[PDB]
Design a binder for this molecule. Structure first.
Ligand SMILES: *[C@@H]1O[C@H](CO)[C@@H](O[C@@H]2O[C@H](CO)[C@@H](O[C@@H]3O[C@H](CO[C@H]4O[C@H](CO)[C@@H](O)[C@H](O)[C@@H]4O)[C@@H](O)[C@H](O[C@H]4O[C@H](CO)[C@@H](O)[C@H](O)[C@@H]4O[C@H]4O[C@H](CO)[C@@H](O)[C@H](O)[C@@H]4O[C@H]4O[C@H](CO)[C@@H](O)[C@H](O)[C@@H]4O)[C@@H]3O)[C@H](O)[C@H]2NC(C)=O)[C@H](O)[C@H]1NC(C)=O
Ligand SMILES: *[C@@H]1O[C@H](CO)[C@@H](O[C@@H]2O[C@H](CO)[C@@H](O[C@@H]3O[C@H](CO[C@H]4O[C@H](CO)[C@@H](O)[C@H](O)[C@@H]4O)[C@@H](O)[C@H](O[C@H]4O[C@H](CO)[C@@H](O)[C@H](O)[C@@H]4O[C@H]4O[C@H](CO)[C@@H](O)[C@H](O)[C@@H]4O[C@H]4O[C@H](CO)[C@@H](O)[C@H](O)[C@@H]4O)[C@@H]3O)[C@H](O)[C@H]2NC(C)=O)[C@H](O)[C@H]1NC(C)=O
Ligand SMILES: *[C@@H]1O[C@H](CO)[C@@H](O[C@@H]2O[C@H](CO)[C@@H](O)[C@H](O)[C@H]2NC(C)=O)[C@H](O)[C@H]1NC(C)=O
Ligand SMILES: CC(=O)N[C@@H]1[C@@H](O)[C@H](O)[C@@H](CO)O[C@H]1O
Ligand SMILES: CC(=O)N[C@@H]1[C@@H](O)[C@H](O)[C@@H](CO)O[C@H]1O
Ligand SMILES: *[C@@H]1O[C@H](CO)[C@@H](O)[C@H](O)[C@H]1NC(C)=O
Ligand SMILES: *[C@@H]1O[C@H](CO)[C@@H](O)[C@H](O)[C@H]1NC(C)=O
Ligand SMILES: *[C@@H]1O[C@H](CO)[C@@H](O)[C@H](O)[C@H]1NC(C)=O
Ligand SMILES: *[C@@H]1O[C@H](CO)[C@@H](O)[C@H](O)[C@H]1NC(C)=O
Ligand SMILES: *[C@@H]1O[C@H](CO)[C@@H](O)[C@H](O)[C@H]1NC(C)=O
Ligand SMILES: *[C@@H]1O[C@H](CO)[C@@H](O)[C@H](O)[C@H]1NC(C)=O
Ligand SMILES: [Mn+2]
Ligand SMILES: [Mn+2]
Lengths: 399, 399
């Protein structure tokens, strides 16, 4: 009769979207994902962790979350959910399953209870929670999307496989940017077991509902938490450099006590080149031809960083506020990165202007900004192209 | 394998929660309900409307929403969706249904389509949108919650059936506040066809997630759009008064060219009576005993209002911001309402602090505020108590 029903439709925001769950220790696990944040009502607790072994019983875990993203301006906010136990709930190894009880608020009493990961009988090995690990170094790619130049990927990979050396791996996160031509440029390296391309294209369901680059670096953290002593975070338009008088290990022992440290930026124009009738720029590598560096006395610029994934719990895109140990922001003239800005989505020849010969010595001004000469990367170009041969061969060898 | 699964559970916000849907004219409809307000994402449209005729032919309307509440500070926001067609979509009276689409954002990828109302064959009556209407006056009560005094419903109901005359109807909204004691006080007026009690007790599922009173007033505005010439919004601790020399018709004809007019408040103390042994307080009505109006001047206080719902599109709790035609605020000279504030929950006797007869003529102080003797309402007590007896019989005594 006058009985007013209320009819709810749709799911404007789910409570928790689980992308990955990873064991991050004998006692502590991880669930990286997305959280809708509440409005005007609590959420104590946000989550709860269990472990249901095949023995039937169950133990409770201490559950605390972090918001290593902004935390406003998106429907969801990236959440890292920490489940630490007093005892390893499965070195019994009779099987087990990680639960997660996710609560809307403190007043209503229905919830969501699901499985985050499962461990089958006889699938555990502590020996890889301790040295040795797979690699010394592991590169964490961004969420790849857009129209991306395969030539940059070939050049970036050849360079950084040489930089990080033989015991390094590169992880990439295809969210649509890994075109067939990009693939063909990763193809040599994944054949060699040096690169991994995860398909995160199912992400299109939440595109715009959370911070895409935060979620990727939180998962790459725990999916490969013990895979390498160091885990680097930067983009394929960034190239790690070292002013001369530095080995990668000679800069690593000096930083051996710091679990995370920043890298300062060499912002390079992606258009400035030299006017030269004899330089055949269409067959020069990107960093070999863009020789002009935004060279300004101390203006705060973007960072990247590395981190001992063993000793962290969440991170951001420029550094971590979720670690144990101290950070080293003082790594300026000791390790750098070259950042060719807006070069990867550029279709065609990067050399889109031509400076006079004089620019090599004098400070030239472009787009209201000044630039200088910097052939530090140019100098390394023939070492790389030669290392490319001895590692994967020609790229007219795919490989 | 490394193909990642974005797996989502729970629902922390429906995209739309329908409370009601009504025809507001030969060509126009309104859906009243709750909406989940977006974040960062473009949402345009929020909605669109179609009419699907019984024989399969469709016709979409132009749809626009209105947000009568504040539009921030809650998981949900009150929304009135207006659908207007280029023709009566059920002209031939063959029947059909009003369909509504709710969008999550602009990618317009996923969407929610659902039936808002249905009109059975032959059911469309064009004379219900032409005078005469069912009542002259219609009252829209607020959302009733808490422990309410049945004795006040008796008194308020008696007064206002008298005040509005026979050609008026009263709509109450039961959100848990209508107790069995309150039901019996309303019962003779329900049996007399003068009062309706709607059961809105479902809104407690979403309680704390939107603005409760903003939902009731819009729904009542549209469910009764053409039931009456004037719709009055006020609470049952509030009594419309004509500073006399003014019949209600005479007042309303002076305002007939205005789509809505507001009404200023006489604040009355709910804890304050004569110290008098000749008076028999437990058997006198509230407005008969509480004779002291707060007398501070130039104090802006909440207002109430009346409205010609036929010329209004959405409303609020103190007036509408969505009408055609003008609005009148200088009504102090001929219509007011007495507000017995914090009088409706009070269990037991309202007379709780007593004053000498020197308060009839001086200015009384209590709790920092001043008060003056006002007997306009008490003068009408014996007239109401009669009127009650003549209209609903011998209600029994003692409040
Ligand atoms: C969820 O949250 C919980 C809690 O919030 C997380 O659990 C915590 O995780 C922490 C990091 O994983 C962990 O802290 C580490 O514990 C290690 C093991 O501890 C055992 O040994 C130490 C003695 O070393 C005992 O005191 C302890 O009781 C245990 O028996 C430690 O080894 C770690 O110490 C190192 O890091 C700290 C912090 O920077 C340094 O101050 C310290 O000096 C150690 O530094 C060495 O290692 C770092 C890099 O790891 C180097 O930078 C440094 O130069 C040192 O390197 C030398 O030493 C190593 C040997 O470690 C040697 O091999 C190398 O060659 C060098 O010579 C660290 O303290 C918490 O205990 C743990 N708490 C709980 C309750 O679980 C959980 O992880 C979260 N989950 C997720 C998924 O994130
Ligand atoms: C969804 O939204 C849409 C819009 O976004 C809503 O649609 C709009 O709804 C409006 C409200 O009804 C409507 O406006 C009214 O239209 C009435 C019908 O107009 C038709 O006849 C006239 C001929 O004069 C044509 O010009 C017109 O185009 C149509 O053919 C009008 O009659 C209404 O006018 C009255 O109100 C306005 C505004 O106050 C006055 O300016 C005007 O003078 C009229 O005033 C008389 O009536 C009011 C009370 O209604 C009195 O206050 C006033 O004193 C006058 O009273 C004398 O006259 C009346 C006869 O009208 C008589 O009974 C009385 O005794 C007095 O002698 C008004 O303008 C929009 O046209 C309409 N637009 C569209 C595009 O749809 C829709 O409702 C929404 N739906 C929902 C569900 O919310
Ligand atoms: C609502 O107001 C309308 C408009 O004034 C009333 O209808 C008018 O009534 C008078 C007197 O009975 C007639 O002379 C007019 O011709 C009517 N107008 C129209 C357009 O028909 C109506 O009486 C009021 N509604 C109710 C229920 O009383
Ligand atoms: C039902 C059953 O036997 N459950 C056992 C529990 O008693 C024991 O404490 C735990 C430790 O391995 O393993 C499981
Ligand atoms: C498929 C079909 O016949 N659809 C009809 C439509 O043509 C007509 O305009 C309308 C009004 O009568 O009724 C319906
Ligand atoms: C890539 O190019 C296509 C067509 O040229 C365009 O539609 C698309 O928006 C581009 N993507 C980006 C990220 O610019
Ligand atoms: C570059 O040099 C060529 C010939 O050497 C000349 O025609 C041209 O004007 C110079 N400048 C630019 C911007 O091409
Ligand atoms: C190494 O780091 C620890 C913090 O984990 C700090 O207490 C200690 O002083 C550091 N040692 C040196 C030599 O900097
Ligand atoms: C009604 O009374 C009960 C106890 O008598 C109390 O718990 C509740 O809060 C009261 N309601 C209101 C609205 O105060
Ligand atoms: C009211 O009057 C009575 C007797 O007239 C007196 O005893 C009492 O103190 C007065 N005040 C109150 C609050 O009852
Ligand atoms: C009546 O209302 C209309 C607005 O709808 C206004 O234009 C007109 O001036 C008003 N008439 C009087 C006499 O106030
Ligand atoms: Mn960049
Ligand atoms: Mn009140």
């Amino acid at each position: 009769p006058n009985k007013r029903i209320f009819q709810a439709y749709g799911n404007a925001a789910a409570l928790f979207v689980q992308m990955g769950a990873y064991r991050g220790g004998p006692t502590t696990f991880a669930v990286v994902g997305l959280a809708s944040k509440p409005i005007h009502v609590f959420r104590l607790p946000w989550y709860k962790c269990e472990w249901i072994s095949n023995n039937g019983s169950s133990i409770r875990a201490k559950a605390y979350k972090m918001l290593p993203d902004w935390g406003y301006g998106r429907v969801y906010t990236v959440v890292v959910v920490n489940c630490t136990f007093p005892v390893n709930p499965n070195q019994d190894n009779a099987g087990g399953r990680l639960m997660l009880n996710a609560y809307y608020d403190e007043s209503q009493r229905k919830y969501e209870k699901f499985t985050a990961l499962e461990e089958l009988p006889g699938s555990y090995n502590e020996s890889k929670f301790r040295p040795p690990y797979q690699y010394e170094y592991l590169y964490c790619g961004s969420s790849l999307y857009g129209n991306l130049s395969a030539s940059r990927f070939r050049e970036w990979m050849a360079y950084h496989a040489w930089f990080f050396g033989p015991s390094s791996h590169f992880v990439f996160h295809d969210a649509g940017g890994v075109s067939p031509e990009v693939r063909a440029a990763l193809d040599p390296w994944v054949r060699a077991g040096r690169a991994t391309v995860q398909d995160i294209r199912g992400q299109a369901e939440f595109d715009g509902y959370y911070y895409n680059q935060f979620l990727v670096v939180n998962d790459c953290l725990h999916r490969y938490r013990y895979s390498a002593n160091w885990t680097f975070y930067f983009d394929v338009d960034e190239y790690i450099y070292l002013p001369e008088g530095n080995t990668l290990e000679s800069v690593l022992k000096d930083f051996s006590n710091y679990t995370q440290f920043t890298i300062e930026q060499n912002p390079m124009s992606s258009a400035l080149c030299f006017n030269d009738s004899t330089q055949d720029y269409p067959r020069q590598w990107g960093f070999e031809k863009l020789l002009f560096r935004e060279s300004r006395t101390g203006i705060r610029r973007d960072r990247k960083y590395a981190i001992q994934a063993k000793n962290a719990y969440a991170t951001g895109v420029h550094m971590s506020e979720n670690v144990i140990g101290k950070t080293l922001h003082q790594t300026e003239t000791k390790i750098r990165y070259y950042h060719y800005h807006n070069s990867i989505q550029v279709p065609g020849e990067l050399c889109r202007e031509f400076l006079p010969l004089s620019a090599k010595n004098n400070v030239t001004w472009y787009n209201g900004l000044p630039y200088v000469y910097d052939d530090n990367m140019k100098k390394l170009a023939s070492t790389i192209k030669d290392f490319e041969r001895n590692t994967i061969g020609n790229v007219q060898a795919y490989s």
